[PDB]
Amino acid sequence: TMSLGAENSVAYSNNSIAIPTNFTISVTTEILPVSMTKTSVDCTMYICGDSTECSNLLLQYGSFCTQLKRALTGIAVEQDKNTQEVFAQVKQIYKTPPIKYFGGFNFSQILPDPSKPSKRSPIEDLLFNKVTLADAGFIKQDLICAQKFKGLTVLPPLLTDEMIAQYTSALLAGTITSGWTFGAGPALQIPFPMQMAYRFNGIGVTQNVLYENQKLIANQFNSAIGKIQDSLSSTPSALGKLQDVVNHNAQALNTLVKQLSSKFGAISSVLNDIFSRLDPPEAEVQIDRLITGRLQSLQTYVTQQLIRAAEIRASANLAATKMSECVLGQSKRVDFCGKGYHLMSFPQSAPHGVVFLHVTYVPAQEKNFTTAPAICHDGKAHFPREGVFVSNGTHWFVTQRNFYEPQIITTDNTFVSGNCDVVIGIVNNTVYDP
């Protein structure tokens, strides 16, 4: 019987608070398909291969074979538009500075490599090697020759992988050097440690935490990136979501092409046999039944193609909005840009998809405390301006809410409103005056 998880129990009481005293930088991963192969089919020689008379009779059905081509071209241009809207979200093509010292953080594993002939990052190269894709409209001169000989063709994407990698590197350089300012207007440079201090300040952690734990944060980020490369390398089933697209496309094409063998009740599956070895007056009817069966097969094929195109377009819209909110900004929507409190994200191209690297913040080491909602000093309730009123013992202090750092309770981080008889749970304590 399935186990739903480690059955846990948290110790609720009404004068106890658990505040983390440490943290942990965690680089997550998320893999999203963007586009699929752009196939195109021609009736006249798929159905009536080398049979003028079959073409003449197929002329009667007629208008059908413009619906098919129209739908297929719509799907193809939709894939091109999907790629455009996912990646081409930057005005200029930014360049990383010639010297790389971003305050101790190490982006070597995500920035492009000039050494390789293709200017792809180590992670992008690893992804491309990991996923095995079929011929992408390579010039004919395998299973591809079988399909290509029946009028079934795959068109090549308008965006070559190298210029997709150029978009990706432009986005990376923009978010590393400028910040989120390059997605809301012009690019405004800023030192990376100050940018990351702002990112902490946007999740309710003061920046004096980063400016004093910069070394720990840099080391954790570097190790997390290394572990991401190792994990998505060793495990082969990490990115089966992209392989599913290729499998389904090639599988549908194979089913369609070998469906040409069924006789649909006719005497033979090859037309010249019906024409030489059978009388024309009902040979017309028999080949008409064959044509109807084959038209039905094409129509079915394009119906699943259209449904799968709609699903891929929904996935591409999700990828585009993740590129906007996650990469170009810093979202507060929880679990949208990775498990934990969101910090940054880094896009990485992949065949027929994109993969993000969600950097998040996770608290690590908690500690019980005794808490109060307010403090009565001189018959006046005293609420915390920002933070909580914890107390290891008689030492009632005021910390921030996401990282234990106690402070003396004074009239600067405490605002007064009322008298200390309306609040249930107020605690007598002194509030120092500077």
Partner 1 sequence: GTGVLTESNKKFLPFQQFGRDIADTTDAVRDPQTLEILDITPCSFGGVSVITPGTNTSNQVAVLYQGVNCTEVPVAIHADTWRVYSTGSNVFQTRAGCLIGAEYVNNSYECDIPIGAGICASYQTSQSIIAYTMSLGAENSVAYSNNSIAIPTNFTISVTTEILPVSMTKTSVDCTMYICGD
Ligand X SMILES: *[C@@H]1O[C@H](CO)[C@@H](O)[C@H](O)[C@H]1NC(C)=O
Q: Which residues bind ligand X (CB under 6 A)?
A: 11, 14-15, 18, 21-22, 24, 101, 106, 108-109, 139, 141, 216, 365-368, 392-395, 424-425, 427-428
CB of 50 to a second copy, least distance (A): 21
List the single partner that 41 binds among partner 1, a second copy, ligand X, none, CB under 5 to 8 Å by kind: none
CB of 2 to partner 1, least distance (A): 42
The answer to whether 111 contacts partner 1 (rule: CB under 8 A) is no
> Strand, coil or helix: what is 427?
strand
Residue 182 to residue 199: CA distance in whole angstroms: 15
Interacting residues with partner 1 between 164 and 193 (CB under 8 A): 166-167, 170, 173-174, 176-178, 182, 186-192
The answer to whether 394 contacts partner 1 (rule: CB under 8 A) is no
Interacting residues with a second copy between 110 and 169 (CB under 8 A): none
Interacting residues with partner 1 between 348 and 377 (CB under 8 A): 350, 352-372
CB of 379 to partner 1, least distance (A): 22
Contacts for 93 with CB less than 8 Å, ≥ 6 apart: 166, 170
The answer to whether 88 contacts a second copy (rule: CB under 8 A) is no
**Amino acid in position 253:** L
Among 70, 227, 258, 332, binds partner 1 (CB under 8 A): 258
CB of 110 to a second copy, least distance (A): 21
Among 126, 136, 155, 194, binds a second copy (CB under 8 A): 194
Is the CB of 217 or the CB of 257 nearer to ligand X? 217
The answer to whether 174 touches 127, Cβ cutoff 8 Å, is no
Is the CB of 15 or the CB of 368 nearer to partner 1? 368
Phi then psi for 177, rounded to 5 degrees? -80, -50
And the tokens for 261? 């063998």
Is the CB of 46 or the CB of 94 nearer to ligand X? 94
Residue 402 to residue 24: CA distance in whole angstroms: 12
**Amino acid in position 96:** T
Contacts for 417 with CB less than 8 Å, ≥ 6 apart: 381, 383
Interacting residues with a second copy between 334 and 353 (CB under 8 A): 334-336, 339-341
Is the CB of 35 or the CB of 429 nearer to ligand X? 429
Segment interacting with partner 1 (CB under 8 A) among 1-9, 14-22, 56-64, 339-347: 339-347
The answer to whether 274 touches 287, Cβ cutoff 8 Å, is yes
Provide the pairing of β-strand 153-155 with 38-40.
antiparallel
Contacts for 216 with CB less than 8 Å, ≥ 6 apart: none
List the single partner that 417 binds among ligand X, a second copy, partner 1, none, CB under 5 to 8 Å by kind: a second copy
List the single partner that 106 binds among a second copy, partner 1, ligand X, none, CB under 5 to 8 Å by kind: ligand X
> Cα 224–229–233 angle (5° rounding)?
145
The answer to whether 47 contacts partner 1 (rule: CB under 8 A) is no
Integer CA distances (angstroms), 274 to 148, 150, 270, 271, 371, in order: 25, 20, 7, 5, 90
Is the CB of 128 or the CB of 192 nearer to a second copy? 192
The continuous run of DSSP H or E covering 359 comes out as strand 359-363
**Amino acid in position 98:** P
